[PDB]
């Protein structure tokens, strides 16, 4: 099925011609547009008062990355290198070796925030929920260097955001 | 065939096979092969000299009338003597169908331009020359369309490095943007993802 958008033939009787002439001479449609704008002036604006008011978000939001850890205090990462292999932008660099007690742990875990595309593949490829994409988004920087995160920065982010990170994970893990 | 398997349509397959035989009968001088895929897609492999005739037929015959040129592209396969493969995709609105015409060429052999048949091909042809280096004869104006001015090489060839050969920066001594040999802070990590234990026996090749 299809419709016609511009297939109307104007009437050619005296009344319609006079109406069109009156519209041309008195600018009725311009006044109608002015009235529409005036009506829109007198209603409440949609502006929010940033930074005192924040826009709504959801538990699935992707923001600044973080590295979580178990309740006992040991980091969840086991250097399986799945997140590095699945990263589309090759923004993750991982180096590992056996620890003092023989545990499989990383010696280097770097994420280049200027190469990352925030696609969330890393947090969904992780089998132990080690790397997560946190809910923070206000982490702008004055220099390029500070956007090259290393393991210490990501662990600090995890320790800093663990409360609401775990809350979001609890809220959303049934959809995954 | 459970709901995890894409359903198969046989009527469209038969119609496409019949039309492929019909086309190959009409133009035996140029068509070298005709194929119909398992998902009902008809493709025709022709000689390079038959680009202008065959296309014209598919655009003007009362039974074909493939009016629209959906896409025109090239594929690089370095293991072949004729390196580049030119692909034309045609859409027929009257019969609600699609066809594909494939041709071969190399670096030095030119291919007659089909601007006269389809005007839409014009920019597409330029794109090919920009990306692969295939020269199209009798083109209204053939020049680079996508790469930078003065760019050396055709990026879409398989032997062209991913990061190119030169990189741009700004120099204050000369107060302008200059090009230098490329040097990466981090080298692109190459992954050997391909694995042994072949997955599709239906595509197994003879052991020669």
């Amino acid at each position: 099925t299809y419709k016609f958008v511009n297939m109307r033939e104007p009437s050619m009787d005296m009344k319609s011609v006079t109406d069109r002439a009156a519209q041309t001479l008195l600018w009725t449609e311009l006044v109608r547009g002015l009235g529409m704008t005036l009506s829109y002036l007198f209603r409440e604006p949609a502006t929010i008062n940033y930074p005192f008011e924040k826009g709504p978000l959801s538990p699935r939001f992707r923001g600044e990355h973080a590295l979580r850890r178990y309740p006992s205090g040991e980091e969840r990462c086991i250097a399986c290198k799945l997140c590095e292999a699945v990263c589309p932008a090759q923004a993750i660099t991982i180096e590992a070796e056996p620890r003092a007690d023989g545990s499989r742990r990383t010696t280097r875990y770097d994420i280049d925030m200027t190469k990352c595309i925030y696609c969330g593949f890393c947090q969904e490829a992780c089998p132990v929920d080690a790397i997560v994409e946190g809910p923070n988004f206000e982490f702008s920087t004055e220099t390029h260097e500070e956007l090259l995160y290393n393991k210490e920065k990501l662990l600090n982010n995890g320790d800093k955001w663990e409360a609401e990170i775990a809350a979001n994970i609890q809220a959303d893990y049934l959809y995954r | 065939t459970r709901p995890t398997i894409r359903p198969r349509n046989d009527v469209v397959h038969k119609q496409l096979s019949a039309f492929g035989q019909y086309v190959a009968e009409i133009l035996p001088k140029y068509v070298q092969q005709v194929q119909v895929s398992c998902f009902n897609e008809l493709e025709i492999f022709i000689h390079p000299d038959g680009v202008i005739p065959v296309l014209t037929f598919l655009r003007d015959h009362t039974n074909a009338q493939f009016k629209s040129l959906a896409d025109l592209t090239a594929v690089d396969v370095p293991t072949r003597q004729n390196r580049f493969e030119i692909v034309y995709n045609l859409l027929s609105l009257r019969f609600n169908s699609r066809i594909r015409v494939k041709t071969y060429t190399d670096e030095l052999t030119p291919i007659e331009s089909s601007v006269t048949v389809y005007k839409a091909a014009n920019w597409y042809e330029r794109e090919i020359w920009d990306m692969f280096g295939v020269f199209f004869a009798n083109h209204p104006d053939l020049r680079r369309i996508l790469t930078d001015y003065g760019f050396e090489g055709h990026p879409f060839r398989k032997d062209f490095p991913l990061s190119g050969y030169v990189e741009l920066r700004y120099d204050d001594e000369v107060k302008r943007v200059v090009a230098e040999p490329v040097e990466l802070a981090q080298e692109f990590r190459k992954f050997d993802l391909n694995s042994p234990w072949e997955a599709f026996p239906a595509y197994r090749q003879p052991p020669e």
Binding site: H144, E145, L148 | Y170, D171, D172, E173, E180, P181
Partner: protein, 297 residues
């Protein structure tokens, strides 16, 4: 040799040249060229600045990530100098003001600050120090600028025996005062000048960094040909298509350029000096809206 400074790469932006250089006064006319030449080959640069960090922004895009570190300092405190040159293996001094100030006179700028820098660099284990003074610097010069330059040169030599003293002669360039000062007036025939191109001076400094035998030598960076003041000004005004700094600058320009044939120059560093005719048009094209001046040799 402290492996971290073993040269690596093909001498590009992301390579490692094994040079850790502290460029004092890098926010000036010569400092930008020196820092650019250092950074285009992968060397790490430490920039001590006393000005607003906004004014130093132009130095940011001349090095790779993390190769340029900006640090606050001032000449009146030795602790800032010590913390700035603590890890550097090369210290280049470009600090110098062409006029007096109620806080820094010529004696403070050219004598005490270079002396403190040289002494702190020697105490901190810096192996290479480069100090720049004027070519005409004489202890008996009528102007205080050159006497202070002369005193400063002696102080650096005393404090840092292995220092390299470079003596350019009225550097000219895109941002120099030598050409813009003469093109902004819109007396001569007995004074000769020997201008030197800015890129030549920067390359000479870089080669002095690389040259191992230039430890205690003193260099004189001069141009290829000499010009009388009058016809040089005539050429300057002709390039701009234009028809023809309180008290010290006029005296300094009114002095004739000295001749030091015993001192090695740019040719000893494998640099062919570029004549003023090639770059005069490039410098003076912005002063607009061919018959080069005669030289004396």
């Amino acid at each position: 040799l402290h492996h971290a400074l073993i040269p690596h790469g093909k001498g590009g932006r992301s390579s490692v040249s094994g040079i850790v250089a502290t460029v004092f006064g890098a926010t000036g006319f010569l400092g930008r060229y020196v820092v650019n030449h250092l950074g285009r080959m992968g060397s790490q640069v430490i920039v001590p600045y006393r000005c607003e960090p906004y004014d130093t922004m132009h130095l940011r895009p001349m090095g790779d990530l993390g190769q340029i570190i900006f640090m606050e300092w001032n000449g009146k405190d030795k602790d800032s100098i010590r913390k700035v040159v603590e890890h550097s293996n090369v210290v280049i001094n470009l600090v110098g003001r062409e006029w007096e100030t109620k806080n820094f006179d010529f004696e403070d700028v050219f004598v005490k600050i270079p002396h403190a820098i040289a002494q702190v660099s020697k105490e901190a284990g810096v192996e290479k120090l480069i100090h720049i003074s004027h070519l005409n610097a004489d202890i008996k010069s009528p102007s205080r600028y050159l006497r202070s330059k002369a005193v400063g040169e002696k102080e650096v030599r005393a404090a840092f025996p292995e220092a390299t003293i470079i003596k350019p002669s009225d550097i000219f360039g895109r941002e120099d005062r030598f050409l813009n000062y003469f093109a902004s007036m819109r007396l001569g025939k007995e004074t000769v000048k020997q201008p030197v191109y800015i890129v030549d001076v920067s390359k000479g400094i870089i080669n002095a960094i690389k040259d191992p035998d230039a430890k205690g030598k003193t260099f004189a960076f001069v141009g290829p040909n000499r010009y009388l003041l009058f016809d040089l000004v005539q050429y300057i005004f002709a390039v701009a298509y234009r028809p023809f700094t309180t008290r010290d600058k006029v005296e300094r320009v009114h002095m004739s350029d000295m001749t030091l044939p015993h001192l090695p120059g740019l040719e000893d560093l494998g640099i062919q000096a570029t004549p003023l005719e090639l770059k005069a048009i490039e410098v003076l094209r912005r002063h607009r809206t061919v018959k080069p001046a005669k030289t004396v040799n």
